[PDB]
Amino acid sequence: LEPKREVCELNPDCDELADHIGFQEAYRRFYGPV
């Protein structure tokens, strides 16, 4: 797994994850590999 969540921070879709946990599950929802 490489730096992929860099874009996640921009899109509120998975960015909201960092609000209560901020791990990867949210990003995996629309990608898969972390």
From Swiss-Prot:
Subcellular compartments: Secreted
Organism: Bos taurus
S-S pairs: 8-14
Family: Belongs to the osteocalcin/matrix Gla protein family.
Domain Gla: 1-32
Function of the molecule: The carboxylated form is one of the main organic components of the bone matrix, which constitutes 1-2% of the total bone protein. It acts as a negative regulator of bone formation and is required to limit bone formation without impairing bone resorption or mineralization. The carboxylated form binds strongly to apatite and calcium. The uncarboxylated form acts as a hormone secreted by osteoblasts, which regulates different cellular processes, such as energy metabolism, male fertility and brain development. Regulates of energy metabolism by acting as a hormone favoring pancreatic beta-cell proliferation, insulin secretion and sensitivity and energy expenditure.
Protein name as catalogued: Osteocalcin
Ligand binding (Ca(2+) 3): 9, 15
Binding site for Ca(2+) 1: 2
Residues involved in Ca(2+) 2 binding: 6, 9
Superkingdom of this protein's organism: Eukaryota
List of residues that carry 4-carboxyglutamate: 2, 6, 9
PTM per Swiss-Prot/TrEMBL: Gamma-carboxyglutamate residues are formed by vitamin K dependent carboxylation by GGCX. These residues are essential for the binding of calcium. Decarboxylation promotes the hormone activity.
